Amino acid sequence: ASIPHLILELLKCEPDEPQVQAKIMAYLQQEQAKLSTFGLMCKMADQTLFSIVEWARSSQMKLLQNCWSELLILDHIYRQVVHGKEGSIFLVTGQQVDYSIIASQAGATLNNLMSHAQELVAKLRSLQFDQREFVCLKFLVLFSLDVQLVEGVQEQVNAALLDYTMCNYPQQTEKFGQLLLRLPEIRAISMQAEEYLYYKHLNGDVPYNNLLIEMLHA
Amino acid sequence: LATRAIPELTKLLNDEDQVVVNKAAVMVHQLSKKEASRHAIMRSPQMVSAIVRTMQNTNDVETARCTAGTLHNLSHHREGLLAIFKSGGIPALVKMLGSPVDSVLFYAITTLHNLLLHQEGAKMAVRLAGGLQKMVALLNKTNVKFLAITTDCLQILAYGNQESKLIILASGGPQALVNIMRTYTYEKLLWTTSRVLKVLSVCSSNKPAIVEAGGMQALGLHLTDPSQRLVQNCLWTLRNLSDAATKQEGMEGLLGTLVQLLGSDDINVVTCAAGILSNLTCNNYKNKMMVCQVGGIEALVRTVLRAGDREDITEPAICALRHLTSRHQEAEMAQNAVRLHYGLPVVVKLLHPPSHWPLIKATVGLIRNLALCPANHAPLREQGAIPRLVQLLVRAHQDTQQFVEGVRMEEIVEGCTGALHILARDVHNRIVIRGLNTIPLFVQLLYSPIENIQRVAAGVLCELAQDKEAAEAIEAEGATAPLTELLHSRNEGVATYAAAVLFR
Ligand SMILES: CCCCCCCCC/C=C\CCCCC(=O)O[C@@H](COC(=O)CCCCCC/C=C/CCCCCCCCC)COP(=O)(O)OC[C@H](O)CO
Numbered sequence: 257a258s259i260p261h262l263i264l265e266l267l268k269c270e271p272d273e274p275q276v277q278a279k280i281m282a283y284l285q286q287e288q289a290k291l292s293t294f295g296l297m298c299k300m301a302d303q304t305l306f307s308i309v310e311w312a313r314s315s316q317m318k319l320l321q322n323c324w325s326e327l328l329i330l331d332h333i334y335r336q337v338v339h340g341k342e343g344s345i346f347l348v349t350g351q352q353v354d355y356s357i358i359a360s361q362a363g364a365t366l367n368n369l370m371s372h373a374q375e376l377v378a379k380l381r382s383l384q385f386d387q388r389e390f391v392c393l394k395f396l397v398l399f400s401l402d403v404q405l406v407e408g409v410q411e412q413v414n415a416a417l418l419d420y421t422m423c424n425y426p427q428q429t430e431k432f433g434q435l436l437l438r439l440p441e442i443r444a445i446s447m448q449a450e451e452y453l454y455y456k457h458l459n460g461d462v463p464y465n466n467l468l469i470e471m472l473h474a
Numbered sequence: 475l476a477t478r479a480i481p482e483l484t485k486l487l488n489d490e491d492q493v494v495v496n497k498a499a500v501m502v503h504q505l506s507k508k509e510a511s512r513h514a515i516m517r518s519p520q521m522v523s524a525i526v527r528t529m530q531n532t533n534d535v536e537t538a539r540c541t542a543g544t545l546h547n548l549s550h551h552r553e554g555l556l557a558i559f560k561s562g563g564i565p566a567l568v569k570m571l572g573s574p575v576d577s578v579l580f581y582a583i584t585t586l587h588n589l590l591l592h593q594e595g596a597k598m599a600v601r602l603a604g605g606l607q608k609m610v611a612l613l614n615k616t617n618v619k620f621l622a623i624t625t626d627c628l629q630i631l632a633y634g635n636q637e638s639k640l641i642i643l644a645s646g647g648p649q650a651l652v653n654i655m656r657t658y659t660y661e662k663l664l665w666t667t668s669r670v671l672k673v674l675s676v677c678s679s680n681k682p683a684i685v686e687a688g689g690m691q692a693l694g695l696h697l698t699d700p701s702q703r704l705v706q707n708c709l710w711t712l713r714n715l716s717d718a719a720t721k722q723e724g725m726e727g728l729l730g731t732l733v734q735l736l737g738s739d740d741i742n743v744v745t746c747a748a749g750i751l752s753n754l755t756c757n758n759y760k761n762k763m764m765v766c767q768v769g770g771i772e773a774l775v776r777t778v779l780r781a782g783d784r785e786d787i788t789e790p791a792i793c794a795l796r797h798l799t800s801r802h803q804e805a806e807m808a809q810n811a812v813r814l815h816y817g818l819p820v821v822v823k824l825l826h827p828p829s830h831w832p833l834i835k836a837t838v839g840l841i842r843n844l845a846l847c848p849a850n851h852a853p854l855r856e857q858g859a860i861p862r863l864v865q866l867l868v869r870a871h872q873d874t875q876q877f878v879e880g881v882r883m884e885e886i887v888e889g890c891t892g893a894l895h896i897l898a899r900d901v902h903n904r905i906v907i908r909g910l911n912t913i914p915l916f917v918q919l920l921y922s923p924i925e926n927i928q929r930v931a932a933g934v935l936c937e938l939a940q941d942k943e944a945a946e947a948i949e950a951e952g953a954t955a956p957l958t959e960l961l962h963s964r965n966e967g968v969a970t971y972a973a974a975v976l977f978r
Contacts, residue, residue, distance in 0.1 A: 260634020261597065412636070418676055419634040423669075426706055429713070429745050430786050437880060 269314035325446040476514035503540035526563040542581035571608035613650035668707035675714035694728035709746035716753030748790035755797035775817035799843035809847035822857040831881035845896035891930035898937035932971035945978040
């Protein structure tokens with residue numbers, strides 16, 4: 257136990273990590289059977305976003321169109337908080353792109369986006385961000401107060417998260433408030449991520465088909 | 475063997491001679507006391523179901539003690555809990571909580587305790603049977619060990635569950651909880667009772683009732699206790715309750731203990747102490763008075779110095795200092811003791827990076843108060859307040875073209891313009907403020923939509939305009955147009971100041 261009942265519900269709506277990670281890699285594998293590294297990544301992000309909408313089978317398109325990018329960032333950030341080694345980066349497929357490569361190939365804008373995600377991952381590892389809080393933030397990001405049953409789910413998840421962290425991280429007087437402050441940082445990074453990808457689209461760099469742009473354009 | 479014993483007593487537990495069923499029961503309670511037989515019982519639905527139903531509708535004390543005791547014994551096994559659950563025993567146990575006899579209460583509450591802890595669905599079940607009311611009512615009992623299990627049950631039911639909380643509130647839970655903290659010294663009980671209060675204090679309906687029940691003063695008694703875990707529930711709870719306590723009296727001891735804890739070896743005790751003090755001194759003049767009297771100002775400056783760049787500490791501490799230096803009988807001695815205690819330079823240092831906006835907002839507000847005292851007018855200038863204050867102002871004004879790190883940049887415009895408004899009471903300061911080429915901004919600020927920004931902008935131009943060249947400089951900037959249109963404004967402050975500027 258030691259986990260409020262709501263947080264136990266939400267944890268039961270989580271996807272199988274090692275399953276969807278092989279499904280996604282086994283999709284990109286047969287995709288090259290060309291397109292660029294940026295095209296691979298667009299395809300991957302595309303797939304990740306499919307997992308995310310699937311996952312959103314729990315407690316619709318007006319919401320998803322709000323946070324799709326915030327969810328994609330938050331997912332990526334949590335992967336680095338958990339599995340993240342220093343100097344490199346882990347993708348939903350398992351690959352380990354070193355920051356040497358990021359700084360060598362990629363340009364200024366994307367390098368800045370990575371820097372911001374690392375300020376966040378640092379911050380969250382420092383807070384000891386854990387799975388229970390992770391899933392809470394998902395729902396707080398999905399069920400935005402910026403788009404009825406929303407205020408509802410927001411009040412409830414807030415309550416549960418506040419109790420969970422007060423009781424499980426007593427030595428951190430400030431944790432609840434700290435986590436919540438990452439939410440507007442995630443949004444700011446997601447705004448810069450949309451704009452960067454929008455420019456890649458205007459320049460023909462994005463693959464003919466991809467869910468990201470559909471969402472962006474709506 | 476046992477498998478043959480069971481189906482027998484099952485049939486006797488359903489007989490119609492209360493002496494038979496009574497003897498059936500004394501029988502089974504003995505059997506459950508042994509490993510093997512007990513296993514046979516919880517493997518027998520008919521039997522378990524029969525035991526519950528007998529305990530439910532009976533009126534013999536003896537059969538009640540033996541059925542309750544039996545469920546207590548099955549409740550030590552995962553499959554025992556499961557049998558009691560499926561068999562509807564939770565509602566019957568909640569009924570036993572009504573019992574006068576103390577052996578039954580013990581059995582019922584412990585069984586309920588193991589259910590709540592290790593059996594899924596039990597919490598919802600215990601709530602639906604009205605278990606909360608019963609448990610709150612049992613709080614006037616006097617067996618402290620018993621009270622320990624009861625409060626622990628309330629905590630399990632209360633945790634992360636706003637519904638249940640509101641229920642405990644409505645049963646008089648707060649007053650009963652606070653009374654336990656005022657009465658007993660059993661660390662385990664006080665610890666379990668303080669978790670319930672902790673959990674309850676985050677609820678906005680419960681918070682006022684706990685405060686009303688003398689909760690803060692009661693928690694105050696336990697802050698020096700040897701038990702670190704007890705002391706941390708008390709600080710957590712005190713911190714949550716303290717934004718809602720400007721009412722209370724009898725606070726002298728608590729405030730006193732709070733100041734002493736500022737010196738704790740424990741960085742966390744220290745952090746909460748500042749936060750609660752910040753909270754209790756906010757817009758409450760009698761607390762400002764009492765904290766100042768036991769050397770609060772001295773203790774808070776020591777704390778800011780000790781914390782260095784640790785903002786979890788300096789931010790609550792600065793906040794308290796801001797409360798302590800305004801609007802009370804001893805506000806003036808305090809604006810001075812901050813300087814006298816080698817606090818000025820560090821307060822101004824905190825305006826610079828690595829500080830974040832929450833600390834910066836607090837510090838800006840403290841500096842505004844410190845400036846009210848003329849003897850700080852010079853020290854604050856020597857330390858570089860003004861260039862930094864202006865730098866932050868133009869930075870937050872430009873960023874108005876939402877909530878950056880929790881802080882609206884429109885709060886940094888106002889606070890900065892306000893700190894300058896007070897600093898400008900000194901001619902040397904006015905020369906510096908003019909120098910930084912501020913006038914065009916203050917005039918631009920007159921058009922700000924926020925009434926409070928107009929006010930401070932009109933306030934600083936007013937203090938500047940007491941000097942001829944300044945007064946003219948302001949004219950030459952297109953001030954006379956917006957200024958006049960402000961003469962007719964809702965709030966007095968903007969009106970009066972606007973008039974005073976025009977005056978020159
Ligand atoms: C971590 C923050 C996200 C950054 C990209 C955000 C928006 C884009 C979403 C879809 C595709 C991801 C793009 C990643 C970089 C890209 O695949 O490959 C780059 C090189 O590859 C190597 O550096 C090595 C490979 C590096 C892999 C990147 C790891 C992160 C991918 C998943 C992150 C979550 C999904 C994002 C959701 C946001 C909404 C679209 C090409 O760099 P370039 O565009 O020329 O910079 C030029 C510049 O910014 C011109 O001036």
